[PDB]
């Protein structure tokens, strides 16, 4: 379980663990290993949050937090309190969607929402994103559901792109087991190589660092 870079063993960064809820790789055991890896390599804190989710709330991410995320976090906490010492447990921050989606963050989401409504090339590219995901599944989805899912990605996009605070604590880097179409998309966005208007408006030359960590 190692990094797939000298600043990492110089422990320059706090590390987030970006959990994909319902993704088969994110067993409790694989989460515990990412948390162990992060505690060893982090500057100080490890931030655990739900990074995506592929009506009790107008915000999809918030609905995921209240319906499933809490019970996920309860299981992670019990596992950690058996696997790690009290002083290591003190370094872990369980960041709900509310701890992340502060004022500044919601302005970034609203910029993306309005771009998704007023720019058809952006809507279409985000929608084509969803279609390739669910082309991999047996289940089928209409165009209205596809357009709904596209909005849901946008809610999580700033957290992948910009360095943000979880309950007062900046984390510059996050770990994820493999490159995805999303992490490739974010990489182009941060460079201004795709939809340059987004970098100009919502990003700021401290880019969120993606660390690929797996067995």
Numbering used by the authors: 1 to 4, 11 to 60, 70 to 230
The authors write:
Cyclodipeptide synthases (CDPSs) use aminoacylated tRNA (aa-tRNA) substrates to form peptide bonds between two amino acids yielding a cyclic dipeptide product (CDP). ParaCDPS from Parabacteroides sp. ParcuCDPS belongs to the XYP sub-group of the CDPS family, characterised by the presence of 3 residues: X40 where X is a non-conserved residue, Y202, and P203 (numbering respective to AlbC).
Inspired by HisRS and histidine recognition more generally, and by the only high resolution structure of a CDPS with a ligand bound, we systematically altered three unique residues in ParcuCDPS P1, which we hypothesised to be participating in crucial interactions with the polar side chain of histidine. From these calculations, P1 is predicted to be mostly neutral apart from Tyr55 and Glu174 which form a negatively charged microenvironment, while P2 is predicted to be mostly lined by positively charged residues. By mutating the P1 residues, the activity of the variants was vastly reduced with E174A and E174H incapable of tolerating histidine as a substrate. Further investigation into the changes imposed by these mutants was performed by solving the crystal structures of a select few mutants containing changes to the active site or the pocket residues. The mutant structures were able to be solved using WT as a model and retained an equivalent fold to ParcuCDPS (Supplementary Notes 4 and 7 relating to Supplementary Figs. 13 and 14). Therefore, the disruption of activity is caused exclusively by the change in these few residues which appear important for the enzyme to produce a CDP.
